[PDB]
Design an enzyme around this catalytic site. Sequence first.
Site, mmCIF file in Angstrom:
data_model
loop_
_atom_site.group_PDB
_atom_site.id
_atom_site.type_symbol
_atom_site.label_atom_id
_atom_site.label_comp_id
_atom_site.label_asym_id
_atom_site.label_seq_id
_atom_site.Cartn_x
_atom_site.Cartn_y
_atom_site.Cartn_z
ATOM 1 C CG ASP A 285 9.034 12.080 5.543
ATOM 2 O OD1 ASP A 285 8.397 11.001 5.454
ATOM 3 O OD2 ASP A 285 10.089 12.202 6.206
ATOM 4 N N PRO B 230 1.865 7.660 3.002
ATOM 5 C CG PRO B 230 0.873 9.710 3.503
ATOM 6 C CD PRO B 230 0.639 8.435 2.750
ATOM 7 C CG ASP C 187 21.864 7.066 -12.967
ATOM 8 O OD1 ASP C 187 22.703 7.559 -13.749
ATOM 9 O OD2 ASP C 187 20.649 7.025 -13.238
ATOM 10 N NE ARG D 91 18.061 4.233 -13.238
ATOM 11 C CZ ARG D 91 19.145 3.833 -12.566
ATOM 12 N NH1 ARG D 91 19.027 3.261 -11.369
ATOM 13 N NH2 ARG D 91 20.353 3.977 -13.092
ATOM 14 C CE1 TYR E 289 -3.146 2.936 0.508
ATOM 15 C CE2 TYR E 289 -2.557 3.019 2.835
ATOM 16 C CZ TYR E 289 -3.233 3.542 1.746
ATOM 17 O OH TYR E 289 -4.002 4.673 1.889
ATOM 18 C CB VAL F 204 0.298 15.048 1.838
ATOM 19 C CG1 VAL F 204 -0.869 14.073 1.867
ATOM 20 C CG2 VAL F 204 0.908 15.150 3.220
ATOM 21 C CD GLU G 133 -8.663 13.341 3.959
ATOM 22 O OE1 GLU G 133 -8.867 14.498 3.516
ATOM 23 O OE2 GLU G 133 -7.597 13.012 4.533
HETATM 24 N N1 LIG Z 1 15.426 11.302 -7.092
HETATM 25 C C1 LIG Z 1 15.091 12.091 -8.111
HETATM 26 N N2 LIG Z 1 14.470 13.257 -7.887
HETATM 27 C C2 LIG Z 1 14.161 14.063 -8.888
HETATM 28 N N3 LIG Z 1 14.444 13.766 -10.144
HETATM 29 C C3 LIG Z 1 15.062 12.616 -10.443
HETATM 30 C C4 LIG Z 1 15.400 11.740 -9.419
HETATM 31 N N4 LIG Z 1 15.998 10.692 -9.977
HETATM 32 C C5 LIG Z 1 16.038 10.899 -11.291
HETATM 33 N N5 LIG Z 1 15.469 12.066 -11.584
HETATM 34 C C6 LIG Z 1 15.285 12.618 -12.946
HETATM 35 O O1 LIG Z 1 15.598 11.541 -13.848
HETATM 36 C C7 LIG Z 1 16.537 12.040 -14.811
HETATM 37 C C8 LIG Z 1 17.376 10.925 -15.440
HETATM 38 C C9 LIG Z 1 18.326 10.349 -14.388
HETATM 39 N N6 LIG Z 1 18.601 8.936 -14.684
HETATM 40 C C10 LIG Z 1 19.635 11.141 -14.388
HETATM 41 C C11 LIG Z 1 20.417 10.905 -13.094
HETATM 42 C C12 LIG Z 1 21.747 11.662 -13.091
HETATM 43 N N7 LIG Z 1 22.778 10.849 -13.753
HETATM 44 C C13 LIG Z 1 22.163 11.891 -11.638
HETATM 45 O O2 LIG Z 1 22.753 10.954 -11.057
HETATM 46 O O3 LIG Z 1 21.860 12.999 -11.141
HETATM 47 C C14 LIG Z 1 17.385 13.020 -14.004
HETATM 48 O O4 LIG Z 1 18.033 13.909 -14.918
HETATM 49 C C15 LIG Z 1 16.260 13.753 -13.276
HETATM 50 O O5 LIG Z 1 15.649 14.686 -14.172
HETATM 51 N N1 LIG Z 2 4.039 10.257 0.365
HETATM 52 C C1 LIG Z 2 3.241 9.303 -0.110
HETATM 53 N N2 LIG Z 2 3.708 8.056 -0.268
HETATM 54 C C2 LIG Z 2 2.927 7.094 -0.725
HETATM 55 N N3 LIG Z 2 1.664 7.318 -1.044
HETATM 56 C C3 LIG Z 2 1.128 8.539 -0.913
HETATM 57 C C4 LIG Z 2 1.918 9.576 -0.437
HETATM 58 N N4 LIG Z 2 1.155 10.665 -0.404
HETATM 59 C C5 LIG Z 2 -0.058 10.331 -0.840
HETATM 60 N N5 LIG Z 2 -0.082 9.037 -1.154
HETATM 61 C C6 LIG Z 2 -1.234 8.279 -1.699
HETATM 62 O O1 LIG Z 2 -2.394 9.129 -1.810
HETATM 63 C C7 LIG Z 2 -3.432 8.513 -1.030
HETATM 64 C C8 LIG Z 2 -4.533 9.487 -0.605
HETATM 65 C C9 LIG Z 2 -3.930 10.756 0.000
HETATM 66 N N6 LIG Z 2 -4.503 11.922 -0.688
HETATM 67 C C10 LIG Z 2 -4.227 10.852 1.500
HETATM 68 C C11 LIG Z 2 -3.628 9.692 2.298
HETATM 69 C C12 LIG Z 2 -3.904 9.846 3.796
HETATM 70 N N7 LIG Z 2 -3.206 11.038 4.304
HETATM 71 C C13 LIG Z 2 -3.427 8.602 4.551
HETATM 72 O O2 LIG Z 2 -3.389 8.679 5.799
HETATM 73 O O3 LIG Z 2 -3.127 7.596 3.872
HETATM 74 C C14 LIG Z 2 -2.642 7.930 0.140
HETATM 75 O O4 LIG Z 2 -3.461 7.010 0.864
HETATM 76 C C15 LIG Z 2 -1.624 7.176 -0.712
HETATM 77 O O5 LIG Z 2 -2.279 6.127 -1.428
#
Ligand SMILES: Nc1ncnc2c1ncn2[C@@H]1O[C@H](C[C@@H](N)CC[C@H](N)C(=O)O)[C@@H](O)[C@H]1O
Ligand SMILES: Nc1ncnc2c1ncn2[C@@H]1O[C@H](C[C@@H](N)CC[C@H](N)C(=O)O)[C@@H](O)[C@H]1O
EC number: 2.1.1.228
Lengths: 239, 249
Positions: B138, B92, B172, B157, B89, B140, B119
Amino acid sequence: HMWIGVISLFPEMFKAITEFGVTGRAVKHNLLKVECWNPRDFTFDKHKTVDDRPYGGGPGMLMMVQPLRDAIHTAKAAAGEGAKVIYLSPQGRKLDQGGVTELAQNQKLILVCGRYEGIDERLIQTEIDEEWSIGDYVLTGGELPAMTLIDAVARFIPGVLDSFADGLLDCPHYTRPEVLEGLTVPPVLMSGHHEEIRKWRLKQSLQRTWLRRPELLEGLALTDEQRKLLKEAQAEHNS
Amino acid sequence: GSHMWIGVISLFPEMFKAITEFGVTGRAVKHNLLKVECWNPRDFTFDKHKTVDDRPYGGGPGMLMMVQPLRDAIHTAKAAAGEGAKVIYLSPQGRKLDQGGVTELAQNQKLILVCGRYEGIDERLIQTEIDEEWSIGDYVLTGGELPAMTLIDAVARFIPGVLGKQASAEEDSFADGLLDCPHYTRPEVLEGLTVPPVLMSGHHEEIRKWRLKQSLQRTWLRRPELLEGLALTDEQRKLLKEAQAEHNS
RNA sequence: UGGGAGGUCGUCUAACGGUAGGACGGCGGACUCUGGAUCCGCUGGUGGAGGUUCGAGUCCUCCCCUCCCAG
Ligand SMILES: Nc1ncnc2c1ncn2[C@@H]1O[C@H](C[C@@H](N)CC[C@H](N)C(=O)O)[C@@H](O)[C@H]1O
Ligand SMILES: Nc1ncnc2c1ncn2[C@@H]1O[C@H](C[C@@H](N)CC[C@H](N)C(=O)O)[C@@H](O)[C@H]1O
């Protein structure tokens, strides 16, 4: 409301948020506007090249600076005064609710999505204002991270609506039927007295935050009542 | 050849075209390396108006997903998957996803991903039908679909043949526990920024060491905690010390 | 700038005293699957002068440059 520019090789992926759920409805009501620009439209050759091999050899492909730069300037242009440019990347600031609240201030943002092995360092140096990561893990592209960010901040656009409301994990929830696979709904939820229920739910949020994610607990300044309920909750667990 | 199956329960299955029709993951799907099937609780709703939400006991903010359509979609998915189907599931309140957790999840041949809306879902369905809870961070979101796609992509990947070059998987961030080094491609000079000469030297050994030293320098400066408890090599230790020195001067 | 070892495309690695090839790289083109791509071409070397030899990348002398062993 809010305006979001996206630079991405797969703008249609963004239909995933602009045509479904809360965000889809936000788009329909003109509360949220999302515009995409594709670096491919900025190529000047038959095969629309937007990337190449990284120097020094080795495997992988890096996106080329020029189509992205040109796309960004086009977006910045059709964006107006003061559009902040963010690059999605795992090397950026790890996103959390505080960061989301900070981001929700900007009225306009432009989001740059990487693919393959990433983008040219010089584009980061010359065009990007801030880098944001959605978590300590690596994805194949930046479109999902961008949509995640957009969604998280959209939960703030006025007129669209709550975990971490108070810095705490949400409480458990129940709906019909009263009994499900032998599991009954907490009697307290049935008393109909709103105040006793509220205190029960709050105690539950504290208990849940404390057990699953105690570190979240470290920074908060709890009210007298919250401290009391958490201690009460603490007494039941070690018994 | 290699292959993975992912069952998804979501009210908006069409969102998944974003990963099944685009990029590397879309190709993985096309090559039968990755299979995704989506069951929609609305197809299970008995209600004439196909109601998929329901009221939470105790009142307040929000609606919860209605138990029967959701429960039934889950039972159908578990049924199609057979044994070895772990149910997750997205929430958060779950375990915060990181690269180690991704490597762990990637050990499963079959997964069923439940995407919440409104919710969330009834706690009793979580206790009786969910195997593990996972959060992507962390913060929502409005639904579990983006989280679900994120989890799928991150794990995708690691399936052999998804990237095509297996060495790309390591090149990466977090792959070897370190952030990636900066990258450059054509042309050699663009708007006054030149490509670092070592990368143009054709000198392979210097290039390998530069890339490695850079990866170390970047990790130390942005995410030094990753370095804590890491098991380097003598060469890495040397390069890092050089980097810490050089950065200060 | 003392005692050993050694100099071949940018890097790696081959060549009997018989015309110096290959891999990677870089540059140039195509490429109706943007593919962590593919395909086709081009570029480019014996550190420098002497001697031996019909001929030297190779043997000999000197000079220059580089690595190892206390500056
Ligand atoms: N954790 C992440 N948070 C935000 N964007 C991500 C994240 N991981 C991958 N991406 C996006 O995915 C694209 C393709 C990635 N494989 C590139 C990773 C790059 N070689 C690095 O290590 O920073 C990155 O250019 C980002 O635009
Ligand atoms: N950070 C997160 N990580 C994983 N699932 C998320 C996350 N934020 C939202 N979701 C998904 O979005 C659904 C509906 C949300 N708008 C509200 C979730 C509600 N706060 C809870 O206690 O689960 C959550 O039950 C998850 O299925």
